[PDB]
Coordinates of C-alpha atoms in Angstrom, one line a residue:
Chain L
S57 CA -18.5 -4.3 -14.8
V58 CA -20.4 -2.4 -17.4
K59 CA -18.9 -3.9 -20.6
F60 CA -18.6 -7.3 -18.5
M61 CA -22.3 -7.5 -18.0
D62 CA -23.3 -6.2 -21.4
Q63 CA -21.0 -8.6 -23.2
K64 CA -22.2 -11.4 -21.1
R65 CA -25.8 -10.7 -21.5
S66 CA -25.2 -10.3 -25.3
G67 CA -23.4 -13.8 -25.5
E68 CA -26.0 -15.7 -23.4
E69 CA -28.9 -14.4 -25.4
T70 CA -27.3 -15.2 -28.5
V71 CA -26.3 -18.7 -27.4
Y72 CA -29.9 -19.3 -26.1
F73 CA -32.0 -18.0 -29.2
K74 CA -29.4 -19.5 -31.6
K75 CA -30.5 -23.0 -29.8
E76 CA -34.2 -21.9 -30.3
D77 CA -33.8 -20.7 -33.8
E78 CA -32.0 -24.1 -34.7
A79 CA -35.1 -26.1 -33.2
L80 CA -37.6 -23.8 -34.9
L81 CA -35.8 -24.1 -38.1
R82 CA -36.0 -28.1 -37.6
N83 CA -39.7 -27.9 -36.8
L84 CA -40.9 -25.2 -39.1
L85 CA -41.7 -26.9 -42.5
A86 CA -43.8 -29.7 -40.9
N87 CA -46.2 -27.3 -39.3
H88 CA -46.4 -24.8 -42.1
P89 CA -46.3 -26.7 -45.3
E90 CA -48.1 -23.7 -47.3
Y91 CA -44.5 -22.2 -47.2
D92 CA -42.7 -25.6 -47.9
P93 CA -41.5 -25.4 -51.7
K94 CA -41.6 -29.1 -51.5
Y95 CA -45.5 -28.8 -52.2
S96 CA -45.2 -25.9 -54.7
Chain K
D42 CA -14.4 11.7 -15.1
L43 CA -17.9 11.7 -14.1
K44 CA -20.0 9.5 -16.7
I45 CA -17.6 6.5 -15.7
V46 CA -18.4 6.6 -11.9
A47 CA -22.1 7.4 -12.6
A48 CA -22.5 4.4 -14.9
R49 CA -20.7 2.2 -12.5
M50 CA -22.7 3.3 -9.5
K51 CA -25.9 2.6 -11.5
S52 CA -24.7 -0.8 -12.4
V53 CA -24.0 -1.8 -8.9
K54 CA -27.1 -0.5 -7.4
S55 CA -28.9 -2.7 -9.9
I56 CA -26.7 -5.5 -8.8
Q57 CA -27.5 -5.0 -5.2
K58 CA -31.1 -5.0 -5.9
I59 CA -31.2 -8.0 -7.8
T60 CA -28.9 -9.7 -5.1
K61 CA -31.3 -8.9 -2.4
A62 CA -34.4 -10.4 -4.4
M63 CA -32.6 -13.5 -5.2
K64 CA -31.7 -13.7 -1.4
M65 CA -35.5 -13.7 -0.7
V66 CA -36.3 -16.2 -3.6
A67 CA -33.4 -18.6 -2.4
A68 CA -34.8 -18.5 1.3
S69 CA -38.2 -19.5 -0.1
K70 CA -36.6 -22.4 -2.2
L71 CA -34.6 -23.5 0.8
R72 CA -37.8 -23.7 2.8
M73 CA -39.4 -26.1 0.2
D74 CA -36.3 -27.9 -0.2
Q75 CA -36.0 -28.7 3.4
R76 CA -39.6 -29.9 3.1
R77 CA -38.5 -32.3 0.4
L78 CA -35.8 -33.8 2.6
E79 CA -38.0 -34.2 5.6
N80 CA -40.6 -36.2 3.5
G81 CA -38.2 -38.1 1.4
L82 CA -35.2 -39.1 3.7
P83 CA -37.0 -41.8 5.7
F84 CA -37.8 -43.4 2.1
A85 CA -33.9 -43.9 1.8
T86 CA -32.4 -44.5 5.1
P87 CA -33.7 -47.9 6.0
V88 CA -32.3 -49.9 3.0
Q89 CA -29.2 -47.9 3.1
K90 CA -28.8 -49.0 6.8
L91 CA -29.6 -52.6 6.0
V92 CA -27.2 -53.0 3.2
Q93 CA -24.5 -50.8 5.1
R94 CA -24.4 -53.8 7.7
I95 CA -22.3 -55.4 5.1
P96 CA -19.0 -53.6 5.6
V97 CA -17.2 -52.3 2.4
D98 CA -13.5 -51.8 2.4
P99 CA -12.5 -48.7 0.3
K100 CA -9.0 -50.1 -0.3
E101 CA -10.5 -52.8 -2.6
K102 CA -8.6 -53.0 -6.0
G103 CA -10.6 -52.7 -9.1
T104 CA -12.5 -50.6 -11.7
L105 CA -13.6 -47.6 -9.5
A106 CA -16.5 -45.4 -10.6
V107 CA -16.9 -41.9 -9.1
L108 CA -20.3 -40.4 -9.0
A109 CA -19.9 -36.8 -8.3
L110 CA -23.2 -34.7 -7.6
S111 CA -23.1 -31.2 -8.5
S112 CA -25.3 -28.1 -9.5
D113 CA -26.0 -26.4 -12.9
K114 CA -26.4 -22.9 -11.8
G115 CA -23.7 -20.5 -10.3
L116 CA -23.5 -18.3 -7.4
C117 CA -23.7 -21.4 -5.2
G118 CA -20.8 -20.4 -3.0
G119 CA -18.1 -23.1 -3.1
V120 CA -19.8 -26.4 -2.7
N121 CA -19.0 -27.7 -5.9
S122 CA -15.2 -26.5 -5.6
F123 CA -15.1 -28.9 -2.5
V124 CA -16.9 -31.7 -4.3
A125 CA -14.3 -31.5 -7.2
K126 CA -11.5 -31.3 -4.8
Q127 CA -12.6 -34.5 -3.0
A128 CA -13.0 -36.1 -6.3
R129 CA -9.5 -35.2 -7.4
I130 CA -8.0 -36.5 -4.1
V131 CA -10.0 -39.6 -4.6
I132 CA -8.9 -40.1 -8.2
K133 CA -5.3 -39.4 -7.4
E134 CA -5.1 -41.7 -4.6
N135 CA -6.8 -44.6 -6.4
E136 CA -5.0 -44.3 -9.8
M137 CA -1.6 -44.7 -8.2
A138 CA -2.4 -48.4 -7.1
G139 CA -3.6 -49.0 -10.6
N140 CA -7.5 -48.9 -10.2
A141 CA -8.7 -47.7 -13.6
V142 CA -11.3 -44.9 -12.6
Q143 CA -14.4 -43.9 -14.5
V144 CA -16.3 -40.7 -13.8
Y145 CA -20.0 -40.1 -13.6
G146 CA -21.4 -36.7 -12.8
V147 CA -24.5 -34.7 -12.2
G148 CA -24.2 -30.9 -13.1
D149 CA -22.1 -28.9 -15.5
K150 CA -20.1 -27.4 -12.8
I151 CA -18.3 -30.8 -12.0
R152 CA -17.9 -30.8 -16.0
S153 CA -16.1 -27.6 -16.1
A154 CA -14.1 -28.2 -13.1
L155 CA -12.5 -31.6 -14.2
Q156 CA -12.5 -31.4 -18.0
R157 CA -9.3 -30.3 -18.6
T158 CA -7.7 -32.5 -15.7
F159 CA -9.7 -35.6 -15.8
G160 CA -11.7 -35.3 -19.0
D161 CA -10.1 -38.5 -20.4
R162 CA -12.0 -40.5 -17.7
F163 CA -15.6 -39.3 -18.1
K164 CA -18.1 -42.0 -18.8
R165 CA -21.6 -40.4 -18.6
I166 CA -22.8 -37.1 -17.5
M167 CA -26.3 -35.9 -16.7
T168 CA -27.6 -32.2 -16.3
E169 CA -30.6 -30.0 -16.3
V170 CA -31.9 -32.2 -13.5
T171 CA -32.7 -29.2 -11.0
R172 CA -35.0 -27.6 -13.4
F173 CA -38.1 -29.5 -12.2
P174 CA -38.5 -30.8 -8.7
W175 CA -36.3 -33.7 -7.7
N176 CA -38.0 -37.1 -7.9
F177 CA -37.4 -40.7 -7.6
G178 CA -38.0 -41.3 -11.4
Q179 CA -34.9 -39.1 -12.0
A180 CA -32.8 -41.1 -9.8
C181 CA -33.8 -44.4 -11.1
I182 CA -32.7 -43.6 -14.4
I183 CA -29.1 -42.7 -13.1
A184 CA -29.1 -45.8 -11.1
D185 CA -30.0 -48.0 -14.0
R186 CA -27.2 -46.3 -16.1
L187 CA -24.7 -47.1 -13.2
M188 CA -26.1 -50.6 -13.0
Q189 CA -25.7 -51.3 -16.7
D190 CA -22.1 -50.1 -16.6
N191 CA -21.6 -52.4 -13.3
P192 CA -18.1 -51.4 -12.0
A193 CA -16.1 -53.3 -9.1
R194 CA -16.6 -50.3 -6.6
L195 CA -18.5 -47.3 -6.6
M196 CA -18.1 -44.0 -4.8
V197 CA -20.6 -41.2 -4.3
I198 CA -19.4 -37.5 -3.7
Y199 CA -22.0 -34.9 -2.4
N200 CA -22.7 -32.3 0.1
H201 CA -24.5 -33.0 3.4
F202 CA -26.9 -30.4 4.7
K203 CA -26.3 -30.0 8.4
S204 CA -27.9 -26.6 8.9
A205 CA -28.9 -23.7 7.0
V206 CA -25.6 -22.2 7.5
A207 CA -23.4 -25.4 7.7
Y208 CA -22.9 -28.1 5.1
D209 CA -20.4 -30.9 5.1
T210 CA -18.7 -33.0 2.1
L211 CA -18.9 -36.6 2.2
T212 CA -17.9 -39.7 0.3
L213 CA -20.1 -42.9 0.2
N214 CA -18.3 -46.3 -0.3
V215 CA -21.5 -48.0 -2.2
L216 CA -21.7 -51.9 -2.4
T217 CA -21.8 -53.5 -5.7
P218 CA -22.8 -56.9 -7.3
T219 CA -19.2 -57.8 -7.5
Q220 CA -18.7 -56.9 -3.9
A221 CA -21.8 -58.8 -2.9
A222 CA -21.2 -62.0 -4.6
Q223 CA -17.8 -62.0 -2.7
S224 CA -19.7 -62.1 0.5
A225 CA -22.1 -64.6 1.9
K226 CA -24.2 -62.0 3.5
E227 CA -24.0 -63.6 7.0
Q228 CA -24.8 -60.4 8.5
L229 CA -28.3 -60.4 7.2
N230 CA -29.3 -64.0 8.2
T231 CA -31.1 -62.5 11.3
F232 CA -33.6 -61.1 8.7
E233 CA -36.4 -63.5 7.1
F234 CA -36.6 -62.6 3.3
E235 CA -40.2 -63.6 2.4
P236 CA -38.8 -64.4 -1.0
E237 CA -35.5 -66.2 -0.8
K238 CA -32.5 -64.0 -0.4
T239 CA -31.1 -65.0 -3.9
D240 CA -34.3 -63.9 -5.7
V241 CA -34.8 -60.6 -3.8
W242 CA -31.3 -59.3 -3.6
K243 CA -31.1 -57.9 -7.1
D244 CA -34.2 -55.9 -6.6
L245 CA -33.0 -54.8 -3.0
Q246 CA -29.7 -53.7 -4.8
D247 CA -31.5 -51.7 -7.4
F248 CA -33.6 -50.1 -4.9
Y249 CA -30.5 -49.3 -2.7
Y250 CA -28.8 -47.5 -5.6
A251 CA -32.0 -45.5 -6.3
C252 CA -32.5 -44.4 -2.8
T253 CA -28.6 -43.7 -2.2
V254 CA -28.9 -41.2 -5.3
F255 CA -32.2 -39.7 -4.2
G256 CA -30.9 -38.9 -0.7
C257 CA -27.8 -37.6 -1.8
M258 CA -28.8 -35.4 -4.5
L259 CA -31.5 -33.9 -1.8
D260 CA -28.8 -33.1 0.6
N261 CA -26.8 -31.4 -2.2
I262 CA -29.7 -29.5 -3.4
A263 CA -30.4 -28.0 0.1
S264 CA -26.8 -27.3 0.6
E265 CA -26.6 -25.5 -2.7
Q266 CA -29.6 -23.4 -1.8
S267 CA -28.1 -22.4 1.6
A268 CA -24.7 -21.4 -0.1
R269 CA -26.6 -19.2 -2.6
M270 CA -28.4 -17.4 0.0
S271 CA -24.9 -16.8 1.8
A272 CA -23.5 -15.6 -1.2
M273 CA -26.1 -13.3 -2.3
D274 CA -25.7 -11.8 1.3
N275 CA -21.9 -11.2 0.8
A276 CA -22.5 -9.9 -2.8
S277 CA -25.1 -7.3 -1.5
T278 CA -22.7 -6.1 1.4
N279 CA -19.8 -5.8 -1.2
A280 CA -21.9 -3.8 -3.6
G281 CA -22.8 -1.5 -0.8
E282 CA -19.2 -1.0 -0.2
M283 CA -18.3 -0.4 -3.7
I284 CA -21.1 2.1 -3.8
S285 CA -20.0 4.2 -1.0
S286 CA -16.6 4.3 -2.5
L287 CA -18.1 5.4 -5.8
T288 CA -20.4 8.0 -4.2
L289 CA -17.1 9.5 -2.7
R290 CA -15.4 9.6 -6.2
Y291 CA -18.6 10.9 -7.9
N292 CA -18.9 14.0 -5.4
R293 CA -15.1 14.6 -5.8
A294 CA -15.4 14.7 -9.6
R295 CA -18.4 16.7 -9.4
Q296 CA -16.7 19.5 -7.4
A297 CA -13.9 19.3 -9.7
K298 CA -16.0 19.8 -12.8
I299 CA -17.8 22.8 -11.1
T300 CA -14.6 24.4 -10.1
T301 CA -12.9 23.9 -13.8
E302 CA -15.5 25.2 -15.6
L303 CA -15.9 28.2 -13.4
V304 CA -12.3 29.0 -13.8
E305 CA -12.4 28.6 -17.4
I306 CA -15.2 31.2 -17.4
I307 CA -13.5 33.6 -15.2
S308 CA -10.1 33.5 -16.8
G309 CA -12.0 34.0 -20.3
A310 CA -13.7 37.1 -18.5
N311 CA -10.5 38.7 -17.1
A312 CA -8.5 38.5 -20.2
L313 CA -10.7 41.2 -21.9
Chain N
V284 CA -0.7 31.5 19.7
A285 CA -4.2 31.9 18.8
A286 CA -5.8 32.8 15.3
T287 CA -9.3 31.8 15.7
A288 CA -12.2 31.6 13.2
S289 CA -13.6 35.1 14.1
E290 CA -10.1 36.7 13.3
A291 CA -9.1 37.9 9.9
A292 CA -7.2 35.5 7.3
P293 CA -3.9 37.5 7.4
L294 CA -3.5 36.6 11.1
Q295 CA -4.3 33.0 10.1
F296 CA -1.8 33.1 7.6
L297 CA 0.8 34.4 10.0
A298 CA 0.3 32.5 13.3
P299 CA 2.2 29.5 12.3
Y300 CA 5.2 31.8 11.2
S301 CA 5.0 33.6 14.6
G302 CA 5.1 30.3 16.6
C303 CA 8.0 29.1 14.5
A304 CA 9.8 32.4 15.1
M305 CA 9.3 32.0 18.7
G306 CA 10.6 28.3 18.6
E307 CA 13.7 29.5 16.5
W308 CA 15.0 31.3 19.7
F309 CA 15.0 27.8 21.6
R310 CA 16.5 26.1 18.5
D311 CA 19.5 28.6 18.2
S312 CA 20.1 28.8 22.0
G313 CA 20.3 25.2 22.2
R314 CA 17.2 24.7 24.0
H315 CA 14.7 22.0 22.8
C316 CA 11.1 23.0 21.7
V317 CA 8.2 21.5 19.9
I318 CA 5.7 23.4 17.8
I319 CA 2.1 22.1 17.3
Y320 CA 0.0 23.5 14.4
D321 CA -3.9 23.0 14.3
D322 CA -4.8 22.7 11.6
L323 CA -2.5 23.9 8.7
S324 CA -5.3 23.3 6.2
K325 CA -7.3 26.4 7.7
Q326 CA -4.1 28.6 7.1
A327 CA -4.1 27.2 3.5
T328 CA -7.6 28.2 3.2
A329 CA -6.9 31.8 4.6
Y330 CA -4.1 32.0 2.0
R331 CA -6.4 31.0 -0.6
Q332 CA -8.9 33.8 0.4
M333 CA -6.1 36.4 0.4
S334 CA -5.0 35.4 -3.2
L335 CA -8.4 35.5 -4.7
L336 CA -9.1 38.6 -3.3
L337 CA -5.9 40.1 -4.7
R338 CA -7.3 38.9 -8.2
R339 CA -4.7 36.3 -8.4
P340 CA -5.1 33.1 -10.8
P341 CA -6.6 30.1 -9.0
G342 CA -5.4 26.3 -9.8
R343 CA -6.2 22.9 -8.4
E344 CA -9.5 23.3 -6.0
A345 CA -8.9 27.1 -6.3
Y346 CA -5.9 26.8 -4.2
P347 CA -2.9 29.0 -6.0
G348 CA 0.7 27.5 -6.6
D349 CA 2.2 29.1 -3.7
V350 CA 0.7 26.9 -1.0
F351 CA 3.6 24.3 -1.1
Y352 CA 6.0 27.3 -0.8
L353 CA 3.9 28.5 2.3
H354 CA 3.8 25.1 4.0
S355 CA 7.4 24.3 3.2
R356 CA 8.8 27.8 4.2
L357 CA 7.0 26.8 7.5
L358 CA 8.3 23.3 8.1
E359 CA 11.9 23.4 6.6
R360 CA 12.6 25.6 10.0
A361 CA 12.1 22.4 12.0
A362 CA 15.7 21.0 12.3
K363 CA 18.2 19.5 14.8
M364 CA 21.2 21.8 14.9
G365 CA 24.6 20.5 14.9
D366 CA 27.3 20.3 17.8
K367 CA 28.6 23.6 16.4
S368 CA 25.4 25.5 16.1
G369 CA 24.6 25.1 19.7
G370 CA 22.9 21.7 19.5
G371 CA 19.3 22.7 19.7
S372 CA 16.4 21.1 18.1
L373 CA 12.8 22.2 16.9
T374 CA 10.2 19.3 16.3
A375 CA 6.9 20.0 14.4
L376 CA 3.4 18.1 14.8
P377 CA 1.4 19.6 11.9
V378 CA -2.3 18.7 12.0
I379 CA -4.5 18.4 8.9
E380 CA -8.2 17.6 8.6
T381 CA -9.2 15.4 5.7
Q382 CA -12.7 14.7 4.1
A383 CA -13.8 11.1 4.2
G384 CA -10.2 10.0 4.8
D385 CA -9.0 11.0 1.5
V386 CA -5.4 11.6 1.6
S387 CA -5.0 11.7 -2.3
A388 CA -6.1 15.1 -2.1
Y389 CA -3.9 18.4 -3.0
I390 CA -3.0 19.7 0.5
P391 CA -2.6 16.4 2.3
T392 CA -0.1 15.3 -0.4
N393 CA 1.6 18.7 -0.3
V394 CA 2.4 18.1 3.1
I395 CA 3.1 14.5 3.0
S396 CA 5.8 15.5 0.5
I397 CA 7.3 17.9 3.0
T398 CA 7.2 15.9 6.5
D399 CA 9.4 13.3 7.6
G400 CA 6.6 10.9 8.9
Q401 CA 2.7 10.4 9.2
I402 CA 0.4 9.7 12.0
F403 CA -3.0 8.4 10.6
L404 CA -6.3 8.5 12.4
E405 CA -9.4 6.6 11.5
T406 CA -13.2 7.2 12.2
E407 CA -14.0 3.5 12.1
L408 CA -11.5 2.9 15.0
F409 CA -12.9 6.0 16.6
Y410 CA -16.5 5.2 16.3
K411 CA -15.9 1.3 17.5
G412 CA -14.1 2.5 20.9
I413 CA -10.6 2.3 19.9
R414 CA -9.1 5.5 21.3
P415 CA -6.5 6.9 20.3
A416 CA -7.5 5.7 16.9
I417 CA -4.0 5.4 15.5
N418 CA -3.6 3.1 12.4
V419 CA -0.4 1.4 12.3
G420 CA -0.1 0.2 8.6
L421 CA -0.6 3.5 7.1
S422 CA 1.2 5.2 9.9
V423 CA 5.1 5.5 9.2
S424 CA 8.3 7.2 10.4
Chain P
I375 CA 20.2 16.0 -21.8
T376 CA 21.1 13.7 -24.6
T377 CA 23.8 11.3 -25.5
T378 CA 26.1 12.5 -28.3
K379 CA 29.1 11.5 -30.3
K380 CA 31.4 13.2 -27.5
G381 CA 29.7 11.7 -24.3
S382 CA 26.7 10.6 -22.8
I383 CA 24.2 11.7 -20.0
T384 CA 22.3 9.1 -18.4
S385 CA 19.5 10.8 -16.2
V386 CA 17.1 9.4 -13.6
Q387 CA 14.4 11.9 -12.9
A388 CA 11.7 11.6 -10.1
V389 CA 8.6 13.1 -11.6
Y390 CA 5.9 14.0 -8.9
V391 CA 2.2 13.5 -9.5
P392 CA -0.2 15.8 -7.7
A393 CA -3.4 14.2 -6.6
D394 CA -2.5 10.8 -7.9
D395 CA -3.6 12.2 -11.3
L396 CA -1.3 11.3 -14.3
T397 CA -3.4 13.4 -16.6
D398 CA -2.0 16.5 -15.1
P399 CA -0.2 18.6 -17.6
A400 CA 3.2 18.4 -16.0
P401 CA 3.8 14.6 -15.9
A402 CA 1.6 14.4 -19.3
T403 CA 4.2 16.5 -20.9
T404 CA 7.1 14.8 -19.3
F405 CA 6.1 11.5 -20.4
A406 CA 6.9 12.5 -24.1
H407 CA 10.7 13.0 -23.2
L408 CA 11.7 9.8 -21.6
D409 CA 13.2 6.7 -22.8
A410 CA 12.3 4.6 -19.8
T411 CA 9.4 4.9 -17.5
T412 CA 8.5 3.6 -14.1
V413 CA 5.1 4.4 -12.6
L414 CA 4.7 3.9 -9.0
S415 CA 1.5 3.3 -7.3
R416 CA -0.2 3.9 -4.0
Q417 CA -2.7 1.0 -4.3
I418 CA 0.2 -1.5 -4.5
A419 CA 2.2 0.1 -1.7
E420 CA -0.9 -0.4 0.6
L421 CA -0.4 -4.2 -0.2
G422 CA 3.1 -3.8 1.4
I423 CA 4.8 -4.3 -1.9
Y424 CA 8.0 -2.2 -2.4
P425 CA 8.9 -1.0 -4.8
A426 CA 5.4 0.1 -5.7
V427 CA 6.0 -0.2 -9.4
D428 CA 3.0 -0.8 -11.6
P429 CA 4.4 -3.0 -14.3
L430 CA 1.6 -2.3 -16.8
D431 CA 1.8 1.6 -16.9
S432 CA 5.5 1.2 -16.9
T433 CA 7.1 0.8 -20.3
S434 CA 10.4 1.2 -22.1
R435 CA 11.9 1.4 -25.6
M436 CA 14.8 -1.1 -24.8
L437 CA 12.4 -4.1 -24.5
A438 CA 12.5 -5.1 -28.1
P439 CA 13.9 -8.7 -29.2
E440 CA 16.6 -6.8 -31.2
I441 CA 18.2 -5.5 -28.0
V442 CA 17.3 -7.8 -25.3
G443 CA 17.1 -11.5 -26.3
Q444 CA 13.9 -13.4 -27.0
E445 CA 13.6 -15.2 -23.9
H446 CA 13.6 -11.9 -22.1
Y447 CA 11.1 -10.3 -24.3
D448 CA 8.8 -13.4 -24.2
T449 CA 9.0 -13.7 -20.2
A450 CA 8.1 -9.9 -20.0
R451 CA 5.3 -10.1 -22.4
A452 CA 3.8 -13.3 -20.6
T453 CA 4.1 -11.7 -17.3
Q454 CA 2.5 -8.4 -18.8
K455 CA -0.4 -10.8 -20.2
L456 CA -0.7 -12.4 -16.9
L457 CA -1.1 -9.3 -14.8
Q458 CA -3.7 -7.9 -17.3
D459 CA -5.8 -10.9 -17.2
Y460 CA -5.6 -10.8 -13.5
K461 CA -6.5 -7.1 -13.5
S462 CA -9.6 -7.8 -15.8
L463 CA -11.1 -10.0 -13.0
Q464 CA -10.7 -7.5 -10.2
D465 CA -14.5 -6.3 -10.6
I466 CA -16.1 -9.8 -10.6
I467 CA -13.8 -11.2 -7.7
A468 CA -14.7 -8.0 -5.7
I469 CA -18.5 -8.3 -6.2
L470 CA -18.9 -12.1 -6.4
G471 CA -15.8 -13.7 -5.4
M472 CA -13.2 -16.2 -6.8
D473 CA -15.8 -19.2 -6.4
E474 CA -17.5 -17.8 -9.7
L475 CA -14.3 -18.1 -11.6
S476 CA -13.3 -21.2 -13.6
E477 CA -10.1 -23.3 -13.0
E478 CA -7.8 -21.7 -15.6
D479 CA -8.9 -18.1 -14.0
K480 CA -7.9 -19.3 -10.6
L481 CA -4.6 -20.8 -11.7
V482 CA -4.1 -17.2 -13.4
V483 CA -5.1 -15.5 -10.2
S484 CA -2.6 -17.7 -8.3
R485 CA 0.3 -17.0 -10.7
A486 CA -0.6 -13.5 -10.8
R487 CA -0.4 -13.0 -7.1
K488 CA 2.8 -14.9 -6.9
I489 CA 4.6 -13.0 -9.6
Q490 CA 3.3 -9.7 -8.0
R491 CA 4.9 -10.7 -4.7
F492 CA 8.0 -11.9 -6.3
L493 CA 8.4 -8.6 -8.1
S494 CA 9.2 -7.1 -4.6
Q495 CA 12.9 -6.6 -3.4
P496 CA 14.3 -5.5 -0.1
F497 CA 16.8 -2.6 -0.7
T498 CA 20.0 -2.0 1.4
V499 CA 18.9 1.6 2.3
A500 CA 15.6 0.4 3.7
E501 CA 17.3 -1.4 6.4
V502 CA 16.6 1.3 8.8
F503 CA 13.0 0.9 8.7
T504 CA 12.5 -2.6 7.6
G505 CA 15.3 -4.5 9.3
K506 CA 15.8 -7.2 6.4
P507 CA 19.0 -7.1 4.6
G508 CA 19.2 -6.0 1.0
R509 CA 19.1 -8.3 -2.0
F510 CA 21.0 -7.5 -5.3
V511 CA 19.4 -9.6 -8.1
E512 CA 21.0 -10.3 -11.4
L513 CA 18.9 -10.6 -14.5
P514 CA 19.2 -14.3 -15.6
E515 CA 18.1 -15.3 -12.0
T516 CA 15.1 -13.1 -12.4
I517 CA 14.3 -14.6 -15.9
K518 CA 14.8 -18.1 -14.7
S519 CA 12.4 -17.5 -11.8
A520 CA 9.5 -15.9 -13.8
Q521 CA 10.0 -18.6 -16.3
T522 CA 9.5 -21.4 -13.7
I523 CA 6.6 -19.2 -11.9
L524 CA 4.8 -19.0 -15.3
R525 CA 5.3 -22.7 -16.3
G526 CA 3.8 -24.0 -13.1
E527 CA 6.9 -25.2 -11.4
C528 CA 6.1 -23.2 -8.2
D529 CA 2.1 -23.7 -7.7
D530 CA 2.8 -25.9 -4.8
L531 CA 4.4 -23.2 -2.8
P532 CA 2.6 -20.7 -0.7
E533 CA 1.8 -17.0 -1.8
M534 CA 3.5 -15.2 1.4
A535 CA 6.8 -17.1 0.6
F536 CA 7.5 -14.7 -2.6
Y537 CA 7.4 -11.5 -0.5
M538 CA 10.8 -9.9 -0.1
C539 CA 13.0 -12.8 -1.0
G540 CA 15.0 -12.0 -4.2
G541 CA 15.5 -15.2 -6.0
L542 CA 13.8 -18.5 -5.9
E543 CA 16.3 -20.3 -3.5
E544 CA 15.2 -17.9 -0.8
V545 CA 11.5 -18.5 -1.8
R546 CA 11.8 -22.3 -1.3
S547 CA 13.8 -22.0 2.0
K548 CA 10.9 -19.6 3.2
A549 CA 8.3 -22.1 2.3
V550 CA 10.4 -24.9 4.0
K551 CA 10.6 -22.7 7.1
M552 CA 6.8 -21.7 6.8
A553 CA 5.8 -25.5 6.5
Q554 CA 6.6 -25.6 10.4

């Protein structure tokens, strides 16, 4: 119950925020071109 | 030991608390879902009855398409279990005669239930439908997807919401254009169609598909919420029982620790 | 045979043995007698008292190791003598009080390892209304 | 107690465990001297299973494939894996329920309950307080039955058909009689 809940929580959070990080990495360089090395 | 039992008690107490909270939340959601049903069922019943006047035989041979409605969240009791059971029954009954079966689904639970056994028959699956409130626009998309893949016979599996503590699984043999062209529609001759029947039938049929999906999904949602409340009740009760047992064990271990430490001190004091 | 709470601990430690000695007369004579002990655990507590006051080393739940020998001395006298030893008998219905139905404790398990049976009683069945509250899946013979 | 070049002593020792505590010094010390082990449990006896052997705490040194065959070894290890996978779900079944589980886990639970009930034998000496006659069971029949239960050739049968039946022919006959 303890290790069960802890590992379930860790996996769920990991998956959710991995998806979100994939989307943010897709949409980053457009909205912040000052960091984009294409324009440097 | 002690740390083990204490940690377990803490976890189970948290589980019980969250379970009661989710119970109240599900009760509120069930109120709103009953309201949605009471407002949105009259929109669907009339055309369904009008086309159900045309009797559909479920023994017809042809490419069957099974639309199984389900949920995306867990802790819904066992409604999706019964849905998938009925779907397996239907597939195993209709695949013997030789009817090539296709499977459409709504929700990830039916997908997880039937992936290993009937995953070589899926055609199109939708999910994340219960995030926002159910609406006719959500149903029209699924109806259009069904019509673009026009099969010879369609079945719809869902859960009827009888009362807050009672549901019922059903299967709707749904009419299709192939089954409509094979009938002269003599049963509708009593009805005066303002446009001619041949011109209005395809639109009445699309409306029928949409209304069917709409009503079926509303009933399934209500049944889901009722089962969720029941499951939260049972889980909180079981958590209380486990808490009682763990409390007994904790007190036993506490007494043992005290006695052991004290005996150690005394034996070290008398060996001088 | 009364050895109550106001009485000293040696008398509680004895009284079971005195009752068994009174029953041995019927057993040897060929007469049949039954002895009931209320509760044996109290006797174990008295023995624990006398032992700790003699500076002896405690053990599990502070009970010494000579508790099993105590109860077994007491209970092995209950016997069905043979055709040549008169033919008498001596039953024994010892009684034990648990705490929250725990029979995985030390004294209950010490006595279950000595007896030829078990009659269990529950608080659920006694609070519901079922009286005598004799469970049947746990009770054996 | 030891086999030597002169003769041999096989020994079968019953070791009490006070207060159901296996961490007590006496059984803890005794574990180191044994070549084979059989740990009985009260949790399993309350389910009516007899002999109440816990097959996970039980172990042995004569299970390797260099002594027994690889079919025996593989069947035993598959059974142990199954029972451990069932043990790992006890908490989530007690709190939430079987409905939360997937289909693989449900199949696992079914086969684990079946193989638990199948590892239950009515002895001859128990006839005095059980009534049912004794059932001697050879080893190859046990292995075939375990193989069949693990493969999935006995999922159609009920769960209470494996209780005190010995081999599988008795299980199928009892399932037939229970169909009525």
